[PDB]
Amino acid sequence: GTFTSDYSKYLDSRRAQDFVQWLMN
């Protein structure tokens, strides 16, 4: 559980990047 918050933030950034690319195409 040591890396979960740090990873959750990275996953957040990825899902937002996925959203943005979808919105641009």
Side-chain angles (χ1 to χ4, degrees):
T2 288
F3 299 104
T4 77
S5 76
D6 271 10
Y7 188 51
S8 193
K9 302 189 93 163
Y10 167 84
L11 283 183
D12 280 344
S13 96
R14 259 190 87 101
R15 276 322 100 68
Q17 183 162 127
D18 291 345
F19 172 78
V20 165
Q21 266 163 21
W22 164 78
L23 177 63
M24 294 192 282
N25 290 8

